[PDB]
Amino acid sequence: LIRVGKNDVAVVLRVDKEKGYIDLSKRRVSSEDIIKCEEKYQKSKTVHSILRYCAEKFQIP
Amino acid sequence: SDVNVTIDTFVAKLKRRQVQGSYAIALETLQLLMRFISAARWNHVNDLIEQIRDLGNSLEKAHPTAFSCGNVIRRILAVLRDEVEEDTMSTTVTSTSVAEPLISSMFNLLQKPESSMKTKTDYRQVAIQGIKDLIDEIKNIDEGIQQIAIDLIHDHEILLTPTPDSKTVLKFLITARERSNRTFTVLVTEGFPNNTKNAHEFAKKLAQHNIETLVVPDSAVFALMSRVGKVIIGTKAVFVNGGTISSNSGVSSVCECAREFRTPVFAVAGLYKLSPLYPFDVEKFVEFGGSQRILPRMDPRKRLDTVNQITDYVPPENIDIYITNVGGFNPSFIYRIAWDNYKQIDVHLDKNKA
Amino acid sequence: MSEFNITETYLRFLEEDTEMTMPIAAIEALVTLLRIKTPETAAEMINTIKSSTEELIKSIPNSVSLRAGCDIFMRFVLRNLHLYGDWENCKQHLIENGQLFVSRAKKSRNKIAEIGVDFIADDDIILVHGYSRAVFSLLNHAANKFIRFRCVVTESRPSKQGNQLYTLLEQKGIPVTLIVDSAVGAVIDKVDKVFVGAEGVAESGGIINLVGTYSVGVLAHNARKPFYVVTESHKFVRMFPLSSDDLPMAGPPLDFTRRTDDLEDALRGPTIDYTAQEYITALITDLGVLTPSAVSEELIKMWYD
Amino acid sequence: LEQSFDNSSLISSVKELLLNKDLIHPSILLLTSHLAHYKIVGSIPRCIAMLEVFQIVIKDYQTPKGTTLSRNLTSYLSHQIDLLKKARPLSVTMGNAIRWLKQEISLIDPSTPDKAAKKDLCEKIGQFAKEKIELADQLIIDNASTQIEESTTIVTYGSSKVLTELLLHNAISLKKNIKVIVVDSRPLFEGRKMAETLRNAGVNVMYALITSLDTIFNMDVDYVFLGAHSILSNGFLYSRAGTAMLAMSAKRRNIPVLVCCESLKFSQRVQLDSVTFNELADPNDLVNKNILDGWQELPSLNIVNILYDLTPPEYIKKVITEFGALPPSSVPVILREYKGSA
C-alpha cells in the first residue's frame, strides 16, 4: 500500500509491437541507471511543461 | 551384531508391562535408539531412514497402546529428515537456499516436474546430539508449566484432579505452594481399582506440603462439581485433535461434568507426549484391562461377565487449554505443533506402502 | 481455433464423462487455454486467463465450486510464476507442469479413500446428504475392503441428488434406505456417523454445498454424533461468509412476491446454506485428515500476501 | 475477602514522584496527567499519543558528556516509561511499540553526529505510525467495507478505535444506508465521543445504554462490531468491560459479531479466565452530599470496577485484520507468521 502511486525507474524486458500489453522490469536495474534515467525524465518533464500550455492555450494539435 | 538382541529384548520388555507410563518408556526407547545409531551401517542417509523406520514399525506393531515409544522415533526421523533439505538446496548452485521455515503444505507437491559439502559421518553425530537434546528436553518439561500456568490459575479457587498418577501435576502443585504462595485446595478422585494405590499416595505427598487437600471417591464428584471451579488433567498422550489419551480412569466422565457445568479444564502435557496420528477408531487407542481386580469373587459357573477400563479418552470439545513447555495452546491448535515437530511421511510409518 | 470461453471448449468435455466434476473441468479448461494460447509475452497471458476466469464465473454464478477451481488456477499460475525462470523457460516450464493436475487431481479421489477408509468402522450406520461423489469414492473402497456397515441417504430437495445414491451403491450391494430429508431428527439419535460433501470451504471451515447441511449439522451437534465431511483439495475458495447466508441466487432467500398464474413454488427459499466451523469436526482432503482450524490455516497461508 | 480480588497488585495506586534523579520531560508529565486523571483515550489513541510524545522526547536529545547515544537512550526512555507505568498500566499497543522502538535503538551504530539521529529515528517512527497503524487501518476500512450491505444496522460498543472511520466511510464516502447503534457504560462515557462525531457527520446514530441491552436486539439488527484492546493467543478478546455481555447476547440471538483489529495488537500471552490479569480503576468514579460518601470508614463495604474482560472465542464470528479475515481460533498463525516479520 505504501508504494502505489509513487514513481520509479524500470527497464523493459519484452514488447509486443502491435499490442500495448507489454512487460516492464526493475530487478535488473543498476544504481547508476536510476539517476541517469531520473535526470532524463526530469529533463523530459521540464521540456514537456514548456509546450503543454503553449499547445493548449494557442489551441492547436 | 550385538544390537539385534537389544532391540527385541526391549520389545519383550515393552510387551509384558515391565515399563509403563510415558516418561520411562520414552527414555528407554530413546536409549535403545542411541544404541542402534551407534552401530548403524547405512552407506547413504535414505538407507538410514529405512533402517530407523523398520525398527519403528516393528516397535509400534509390538505395542500400539503406548505412544511415547512411537513418537520419539518419529521426532528423530523428522529432525534427521530436516537436514536433508537444508544441505540439498544449498549444494545446488542455481537457487541455493530459501531458508524459510513455514510453507503452504498444499500446493508445493502439486507442481513437481519430477567445504562441508557432504561429510558422510555427520548424520551420526547430529543424530547423537538430537538424542542428547531430546534427553535435555524431556528431563525438564515442568519449567514451562510452572512458568506459564501460574498466569492461568488464581488464588482462592478449590481444585479437582482426576489424574493423580502424573509427576507433572505433582511437581506443579508442589511448586505452586513452594515458590509462589497461592493457597488453595485440591479435590482428588480415585480411579478404582487402579489409582486407589496412587490417589492416596497423591494425597499423602500433598499433605506433606499441606495444601488443604481432600479425597473424594468417584461417585461423589458430581455433588462436589458445583463447588469446584477448575479441573486439571495430567495426560499420557495427546493427538492432533487434542483428543488426549489419559492415565488410569475417571477422566472420560468427570471432564464431561466439567463441560456441562461450564467449568474450565486444564491439561498439562510434555512435548514428547504428542502424536501426529489420529484417533481413527477410538476404542483401538484405549487399553481395556483385566477383570480380576473389580470383583475378587472369581465367579466359577454363574460367571457374570464384566468390563474394566484402564484408559479414558476425552474429546477436544470437553477440554479447554493445553499447558505445554512451549506455551499455552488451544485444543484446535495442536496440529501445528505436531507439524512443527513431525512430517507428513512418518505418520503411516510402514515399509509396505499399501 | 477455439476461444475457450463458455462452450467452445469447456462444456464440450463435460459431455465426455459424467464422472469429472465442475472444478477440475475448470482446471482442465484453464490449463488448455494457455497450453495453446501462449503469445510469447508474460503480460497478456495473465490478462487472458483473468478475463477467462471472470467470464467463466459470469457464465454460471451459482455453482461456487467453479469459483474454487478458477481461483486455485490463479494460485497455480502465481506459484508457477514464482521460482523466477525469467519467462524464458516458463513458456515451456509452466506448460510442462501443465497437465500435472489432470494427472494429479483426477486420481485424487482414490487417495481420499486410502486415508478415509479407516473412519467407517464395523457396523456403523452412516448418513450421507446429497450426491457428493467423493463420499461414494470413499464408500466404494470401503465396500471393496469387505467391512460391514449400513447407509442412510437423505433427500436433496429440490436438487434431486438424494435419489442418485440409492441407485448407486444399492447395485454395489450395500443395505441402504432412503430417508426423507425432514426425518433427520427422528433418526439421527440412531445414526452412528454422518458424512457430507462440500461444494466449498470458507476461511474457517464451512460447508457451502446444498440446501440443508446446516440443518443436519445442527442435528448432529444436538445428538453429539460426529459430523465428518469428505472433500478434496480443489474445493478451497476465498468466499468467507459470516451469516448462514451466502451470495444470493438471484434475490434474497425470503421472497414475498406474487406467483403470476402457475409458476414454480418449491425453489423459493435458499438453495445453498452455510455451516460454521463448530458443527464440522474433521474434514478429509488430499492433505490427510484435517481439523477445521488446520483448514483455516491452510486457506489462510496461500491467500495472504 | 471471600475472593480477595480487590487486593490484586497489577496496578499500584501510588502517586507524586518528586524525585529529580532524571530529566523527566514536561511534555511526558502532561501526557501522564492527561491519561491518568481524565481518561480521553482508547488503545491506539494511547499508542499515537505515546508515539508522538516520544517523537518530541527524542527530538529534544540533550546528550550527556561522555556517553554515546547508543548507550544512554534506552535507559533514559525506560525512565520515561516508568512515569506512564505509574499513571496507567500499559496496552499491547504500548508494549509492541516500545519493544520495537528499543530494537531500533539497538541497531544504531556509534557514528551518528546527533544530526542524522533525527533522520533515522523521527522519520522511522513516523514510518512506524504510518505503516503499523494508519495505512493498516486503511486496509481495515478497505477490507471491512465489502462486508456491509446497504440499509443495515451496526451495534458498536464504547469508543471505537479504528471503526469510527469505517462507519464514516460507509456512511458518507460510499453513501450506502446504515443505522449505527452506539452503546456504552458507566463510568467512562466514551460512546458519546463516537455519537457526537458520527451524528455531527450526519449518520443515523441511536445512542443507548448497556442496562437496556435487551431492547436493542429485539429490533432489526445485525453486524455487531467491536473494538479490541488486544487479542490473546487463544482467541480470547480483551477490550473495555461490558463488551462480553453484548458479545454473548449477540451470539445468543444468532446475529454475527466482528472485531476490527490490526496485527500490531495481537499478544503473546495467554489467559482464559476474566478476572485474572486486569486493571482496577479508581473507585471514587462510581459515585458521581453525594449518593454515598465514604466506602472507607464504613466496615464491610467495597466498590470495585473493571476495565478489561474477555469474550470467549466461541462468540466472535470474525476477527478482521489488515492481512484478511480469520477465525479467532487461528490467531497464533498470525502471531507466528506475520507479527514482527512484517
Side-chain angles (χ1 to χ4, degrees):
Chain A
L1 188 62
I2 199 168
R3 296 175 70 186
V4 295
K6 290 183 180 179
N7 55 0
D8 53 353
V9 68
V11 71
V12 180
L13 288 177
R14 289 177 302 276
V15 160
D16 290 330
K17 188 179 177 181
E18 54 90 17
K19 296 300 291 181
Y21 293 149
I22 51 98
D23 289 326
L24 291 258
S25 173
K26 69 179 181 183
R27 184 177 181 270
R28 295 179 64 190
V29 171
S30 178
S31 178
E32 183 181 1
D33 297 331
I34 302 168
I35 290 97
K36 287 176 70 69
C37 186
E38 192 271 333
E39 193 269 331
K40 186 181 263 78
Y41 182 70
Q42 182 61 256
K43 180 180 288 291
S44 171
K45 293 299 291 294
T46 191
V47 302
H48 288 169
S49 62
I50 63 174
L51 297 177
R52 180 69 179 271
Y53 72 100
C54 294
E56 290 183 353
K57 291 181 186 294
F58 189 72
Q59 298 296 321
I60 52 171
Chain B
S1 297
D2 290 331
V3 69
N4 295 115
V5 61
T6 59
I7 52 104
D8 309 328
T9 195
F10 177 66
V11 165
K13 185 173 172 64
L14 54 80
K15 291 285 192 175
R16 294 96 157 100
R17 301 294 184 275
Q18 283 80 23
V19 64
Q20 68 272 17
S22 178
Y23 180 78
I25 186 169
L27 268 70
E28 287 183 355
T29 189
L30 197 149
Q31 183 63 254
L32 186 273
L33 192 142
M34 187 177 74
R35 296 290 188 271
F36 183 75
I37 296 299
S38 295
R41 293 180 180 91
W42 57 86
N43 204 6
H44 191 272
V45 68
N46 287 112
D47 295 332
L48 194 274
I49 59 96
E50 180 66 32
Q51 294 294 320
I52 203 165
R53 186 174 178 179
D54 57 356
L55 177 64
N57 193 5
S58 176
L59 197 146
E60 183 180 0
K61 183 259 290 180
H63 183 71
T65 179
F67 300 100
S68 298
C69 65
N71 56 1
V72 173
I73 50 178
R74 289 185 177 93
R75 188 176 184 180
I76 197 163
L77 192 147
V79 77
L80 194 145
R81 184 65 61 86
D82 196 5
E83 293 180 354
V84 176
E85 300 156 28
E86 150 183 319
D87 291 12
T88 302
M89 294 300 293
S90 36
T91 294
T92 77
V93 175
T94 294
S95 284
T96 80
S97 64
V98 175
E100 183 65 13
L102 316 175
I103 297 295
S104 171
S105 69
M106 187 273 288
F107 183 73
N108 200 4
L109 297 172
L110 273 71
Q111 62 93 32
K112 295 277 98 176
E114 293 176 354
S115 297
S116 66
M117 190 181 290
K118 276 79 176 175
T119 67
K120 184 180 183 292
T121 187
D122 62 350
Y123 293 99
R124 183 182 295 275
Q125 290 92 25
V126 74
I128 294 301
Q129 71 94 31
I131 285 296
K132 290 184 184 293
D133 66 357
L134 260 291
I135 285 299
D136 292 331
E137 178 177 357
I138 293 170
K139 285 188 178 294
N140 56 8
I141 60 171
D142 56 352
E143 183 177 1
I145 311 299
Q146 68 189 359
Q147 181 178 1
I148 75 165
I150 51 95
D151 200 6
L152 197 59
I153 193 168
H154 65 276
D155 195 2
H156 293 284
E157 189 185 12
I158 65 171
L159 293 178
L160 176 57
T161 171
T163 56
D165 51 351
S166 178
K167 292 176 71 175
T168 63
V169 293
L170 194 276
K171 294 187 291 294
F172 173 66
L173 270 64
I174 291 302
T175 193
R177 182 64 186 270
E178 194 266 326
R179 292 180 302 171
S180 177
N181 199 1
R182 293 182 181 179
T183 176
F184 57 91
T185 184
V186 279
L187 279 72
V188 54
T189 183
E190 69 267 14
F192 183 78
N194 302 113
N195 290 321
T196 184
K197 297 290 178 67
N198 291 319
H200 295 284
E201 295 290 327
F202 183 73
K204 186 180 290 293
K205 294 296 291 295
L206 295 183
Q208 185 177 1
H209 295 88
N210 64 19
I211 42 169
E212 194 57 33
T213 185
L214 63 93
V215 176
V216 299
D218 70 30
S219 65
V221 75
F222 187 81
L224 281 80
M225 196 64 212
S226 66
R227 294 291 188 272
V228 62
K230 191 180 292 296
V231 302
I232 185 168
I233 294 172
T235 185
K236 184 176 76 174
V238 54
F239 294 158
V240 301
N241 290 326
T244 192
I245 289 298
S246 66
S247 294
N248 291 320
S249 67
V251 313
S252 181
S253 65
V254 64
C255 183
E256 186 63 40
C257 294
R259 181 64 178 174
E260 193 270 331
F261 282 173
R262 295 291 184 271
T263 301
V265 177
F266 289 176
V268 302
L271 198 275
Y272 64 96
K273 294 180 181 179
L274 269 299
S275 175
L277 293 175
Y278 186 84
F280 293 106
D281 194 1
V282 65
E283 293 178 354
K284 291 182 180 179
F285 298 99
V286 165
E287 185 180 1
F288 286 155
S291 296
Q292 282 290 319
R293 292 190 294 273
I294 63 177
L295 62 98
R297 288 176 286 165
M298 195 183 291
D299 44 357
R301 298 293 185 272
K302 302 297 188 292
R303 191 170 173 82
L304 51 94
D305 187 75
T306 188
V307 178
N308 197 3
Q309 181 165 5
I310 322 295
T311 292
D312 283 337
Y313 177 79
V314 308
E317 290 86 4
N318 298 114
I319 202 164
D320 198 4
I321 203 68
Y322 283 103
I323 304 167
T324 65
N325 53 2
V326 296
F329 296 97
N330 281 321
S332 67
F333 194 69
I334 301 301
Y335 66 96
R336 180 56 61 191
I337 300 170
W339 305 115
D340 286 335
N341 289 315
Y342 300 101
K343 298 292 184 183
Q344 294 16 65
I345 294 97
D346 53 350
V347 293
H348 290 171
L349 195 145
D350 191 75
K351 175 62 173 66
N352 194 2
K353 271 80 71 178
Chain C
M1 187 269 286
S2 175
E3 294 294 327
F4 300 92
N5 296 113
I6 301 295
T7 185
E8 69 271 17
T9 307
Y10 180 75
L11 292 175
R12 290 182 180 178
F13 64 98
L14 270 69
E15 292 181 353
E16 182 67 27
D17 192 2
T18 61
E19 182 68 26
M20 59 179 72
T21 179
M22 300 298 289
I24 45 93
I27 293 295
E28 200 277 332
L30 290 172
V31 298
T32 193
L33 176 63
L34 83 165
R35 189 179 67 192
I36 292 95
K37 289 183 180 180
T38 168
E40 67 263 10
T41 300
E44 69 269 15
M45 182 273 289
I46 320 169
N47 193 4
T48 301
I49 60 97
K50 185 176 180 180
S51 66
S52 296
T53 53
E54 288 185 354
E55 57 84 23
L56 189 59
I57 293 171
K58 186 175 71 176
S59 67
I60 297 96
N62 294 317
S63 181
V64 300
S65 63
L66 291 174
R67 187 174 295 170
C70 293
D71 212 357
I72 67 163
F73 178 74
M74 188 67 207
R75 292 297 175 188
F76 165 67
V77 304
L78 190 143
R79 184 67 184 272
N80 203 358
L81 184 64
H82 193 268
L83 296 172
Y84 188 66
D86 293 330
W87 185 257
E88 182 67 28
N89 59 5
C90 292
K91 292 182 284 186
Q92 186 64 41
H93 183 72
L94 200 152
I95 64 171
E96 73 186 359
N97 286 319
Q99 62 185 357
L100 279 177
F101 286 108
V102 304
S103 71
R104 176 66 177 88
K106 297 293 189 292
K107 66 177 188 181
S108 293
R109 288 177 58 187
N110 56 4
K111 189 181 289 293
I112 301 300
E114 293 292 328
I115 62 172
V117 162
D118 295 331
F119 280 158
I120 173 169
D122 193 7
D123 189 73
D124 288 333
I125 176 166
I126 299 300
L127 196 279
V128 303
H129 189 76
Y131 183 70
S132 54
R133 62 189 68 189
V135 173
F136 181 72
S137 295
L138 188 147
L139 268 293
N140 191 2
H141 194 274
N144 290 318
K145 190 61 69 70
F146 295 100
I147 197 166
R148 190 263 306 276
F149 62 94
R150 291 187 298 273
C151 292
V152 180
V153 178
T154 61
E155 287 283 333
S156 300
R157 289 298 307 272
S159 178
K160 186 262 293 180
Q161 292 178 356
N163 200 5
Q164 291 179 356
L165 269 298
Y166 190 76
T167 60
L168 186 60
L169 59 91
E170 180 184 4
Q171 57 92 33
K172 184 66 178 178
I174 289 95
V176 59
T177 185
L178 190 144
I179 195 175
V180 293
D181 53 355
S182 182
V184 176
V187 168
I188 206 168
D189 291 329
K190 293 182 182 293
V191 175
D192 293 330
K193 294 180 176 67
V194 48
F195 291 160
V196 295
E199 295 178 355
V201 175
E203 293 182 353
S204 176
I207 305 304
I208 314 173
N209 53 3
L210 200 60
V211 172
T213 53
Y214 182 75
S215 67
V216 73
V218 71
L219 262 300
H221 188 274
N222 205 356
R224 293 180 185 267
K225 302 298 183 183
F227 185 76
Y228 294 157
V229 47
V230 177
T231 181
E232 66 270 13
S233 296
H234 61 79
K235 303 293 288 187
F236 301 99
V237 70
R238 187 180 288 173
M239 295 296 107
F240 175 59
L242 71 160
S243 67
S244 178
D245 291 330
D246 299 327
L247 76 161
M249 50 178 185
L254 275 302
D255 288 331
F256 294 104
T257 63
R258 277 79 174 270
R259 175 177 60 86
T260 63
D261 197 4
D262 53 353
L263 59 91
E264 183 65 29
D265 301 329
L267 196 145
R268 299 291 293 166
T271 184
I272 292 170
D273 62 357
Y274 179 75
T275 303
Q277 61 91 30
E278 182 67 29
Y279 297 98
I280 60 173
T281 180
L283 59 92
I284 304 163
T285 55
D286 294 332
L287 279 71
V289 64
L290 201 63
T291 182
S293 61
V295 82
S296 75
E297 182 177 358
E298 190 65 29
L299 210 149
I300 211 111
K301 191 184 286 184
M302 61 176 282
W303 294 96
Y304 282 170
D305 51 353
Chain D
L1 59 92
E2 295 292 327
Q3 75 274 17
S4 178
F5 181 70
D6 53 353
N7 195 1
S8 296
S9 179
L10 277 305
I11 188 169
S12 181
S13 66
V14 295
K15 294 180 177 68
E16 194 178 3
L17 289 176
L18 193 144
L19 272 299
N20 289 318
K21 180 68 172 66
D22 196 0
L23 192 276
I24 293 97
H25 193 192
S27 299
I28 207 168
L29 194 146
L30 175 60
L31 193 274
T32 54
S33 178
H34 195 192
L35 290 178
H37 181 73
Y38 184 69
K39 299 179 181 180
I40 56 101
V41 293
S43 76
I44 60 97
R46 279 182 287 173
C47 184
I48 291 175
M50 175 268 290
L51 207 65
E52 292 183 352
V53 73
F54 283 169
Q55 178 64 261
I56 304 299
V57 83
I58 60 97
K59 188 178 262 76
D60 295 335
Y61 293 94
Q62 295 299 107
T63 60
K65 295 181 184 292
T67 306
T68 315
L69 190 144
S70 65
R71 295 181 185 272
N72 55 358
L73 203 277
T74 177
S75 65
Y76 181 72
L77 194 146
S78 68
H79 191 273
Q80 299 296 321
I81 286 292
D82 291 330
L83 188 63
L84 280 78
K85 285 183 177 178
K86 185 177 74 69
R88 181 175 175 178
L90 277 72
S91 69
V92 303
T93 59
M94 287 288 177
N96 298 119
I98 60 98
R99 66 99 178 268
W100 180 79
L101 186 63
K102 290 182 184 292
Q103 289 181 358
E104 291 296 328
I105 291 164
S106 66
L107 59 88
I108 205 166
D109 51 352
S111 65
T112 301
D114 201 359
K115 182 62 69 178
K118 292 181 181 179
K119 301 295 186 290
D120 65 356
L121 272 76
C122 170
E123 186 176 1
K124 188 167 70 177
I125 201 166
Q127 287 179 357
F128 181 76
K130 191 177 179 182
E131 183 176 0
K132 297 293 287 184
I133 298 298
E134 202 278 331
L135 60 90
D137 290 332
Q138 180 59 255
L139 291 176
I140 298 301
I141 308 308
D142 292 328
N143 199 1
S145 296
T146 188
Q147 293 179 356
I148 293 171
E149 292 85 3
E150 69 271 14
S151 70
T152 188
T153 63
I154 302 294
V155 177
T156 71
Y157 179 71
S159 175
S160 165
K161 304 174 179 69
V162 52
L163 58 89
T164 55
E165 285 83 3
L166 192 276
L167 294 174
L168 293 180
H169 183 78
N170 297 120
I172 301 169
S173 181
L174 292 176
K175 294 181 291 296
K176 63 186 180 183
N177 196 3
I178 186 168
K179 293 187 286 184
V180 177
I181 292 96
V182 178
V183 56
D184 55 355
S185 67
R186 183 77 181 277
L188 279 77
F189 293 98
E190 57 181 359
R192 293 171 65 188
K193 289 174 93 287
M194 289 182 67
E196 290 180 352
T197 302
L198 268 69
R199 184 57 183 266
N200 194 4
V203 70
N204 293 318
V205 185
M206 188 179 71
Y207 183 80
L209 286 179
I210 189 167
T211 62
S212 67
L213 192 147
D214 195 1
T215 187
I216 290 98
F217 289 157
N218 294 118
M219 299 183 294
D220 194 2
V221 62
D222 45 354
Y223 295 106
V224 171
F225 289 165
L226 294 176
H229 176 273
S230 70
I231 293 173
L232 271 296
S233 298
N234 304 326
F236 288 94
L237 193 64
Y238 189 75
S239 65
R240 295 298 189 276
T243 300
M245 288 185 288
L246 65 90
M248 59 86 71
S249 297
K251 190 261 185 294
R252 182 176 183 266
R253 293 177 179 89
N254 63 18
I255 52 99
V257 179
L258 285 81
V259 173
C260 294
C261 179
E262 68 269 14
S263 64
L264 189 273
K265 199 182 284 288
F266 293 163
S267 179
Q268 291 296 112
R269 61 177 296 274
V270 55
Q271 62 180 353
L272 58 90
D273 288 331
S274 296
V275 283
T276 298
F277 178 77
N278 203 354
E279 180 177 0
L280 274 301
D282 201 4
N284 58 5
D285 201 5
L286 294 177
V287 174
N288 299 114
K289 182 64 71 177
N290 50 9
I291 299 98
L292 60 79
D293 186 74
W295 61 93
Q296 72 273 15
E297 189 271 331
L298 272 71
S300 163
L301 198 152
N302 196 359
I303 294 169
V304 67
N305 54 0
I306 293 301
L307 290 178
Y308 291 153
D309 55 356
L310 282 75
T311 80
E314 290 87 6
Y315 295 153
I316 298 170
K317 184 62 68 69
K318 185 192 296 184
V319 168
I320 183 167
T321 191
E322 73 270 20
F323 297 101
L326 58 102
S329 64
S330 176
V331 297
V333 314
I334 300 176
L335 286 175
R336 67 185 294 161
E337 183 178 2
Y338 298 101
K339 182 180 178 181
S341 297

